[PDB]
Design a protein around this ligand. Structure first.
Ligand code: COH
Length: 153
């Protein structure tokens, strides 16, 4: 469980992410696709994008980035009490999109990488540690739902 002080570090930097949701969303998805190409193959809607320039130019990719970060933000602001938000997400990602938990670890790494690039002064070691913990909590709760449904993996 994150302490109140750790949640404050997470939300203080998230308020900055919200100043440019679309720019952030885009950098995250691109970092994910370049670092872990197998992840792009899960998106029939983005599979045709081959280069980073092509990814940067896609307005549809930018729109999905806002969708991803908006959902994540609603979860983070619940400070661990995210049962109602997390459930629909685990169900669709496990049963409809077939996303293994490992890919959720990959996007977590991408989020941390981007926050670090864009907000050095608001993202020192202490904030990076709190953010990692918040993302691990998210994965842990989703992994439990996956197990229930028969998808742990
Ligand atoms: C490697 C693939 C991958 C990852 C790691 C991932 C991780 C995450 C993530 C973790 C931080 C968040 C908050 C979301 C949030 C969402 N994802 Co995904 N998703 C993934 C693949 C998908 C796919 C595929 C879709 C459907 C896209 C489409 O066709 O519109 C998707 C749809 C969504 C939607 C639309 C509604 C729904 O279908 O659930 C939201 C919200 N998500 N996703």
């Amino acid at each position: 469980v994150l302490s109140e002080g750790e949640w404050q570090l997470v939300l203080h930097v998230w308020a900055k992410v919200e100043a440019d949701v679309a720019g952030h969303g885009q950098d995250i998805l691109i970092r994910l696709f370049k670092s872990h190409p197998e992840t792009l193959e899960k998106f029939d809607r983005f599979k045709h994008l081959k280069t980073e320039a092509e990814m940067k130019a896609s307005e549809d990719l930018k729109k999905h980035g806002v969708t991803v970060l908006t959902a994540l933000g609603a979860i983070l602001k619940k400070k661990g009490h995210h049962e109602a938000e997390l459930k629909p997400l685990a169900q669709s990602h496990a049963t409809k999109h077939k996303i293994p938990i490992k890919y959720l670890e990959f996007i977590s790494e991408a989020i941390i990488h981007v926050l670090h690039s864009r907000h050095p002064g608001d993202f020192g070691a202490d904030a990076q540690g709190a953010m990692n913990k918040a993302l691990e909590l998210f994965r842990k709760d989703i992994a439990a739902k996956y197990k229930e449904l028969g998808y742990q993996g």
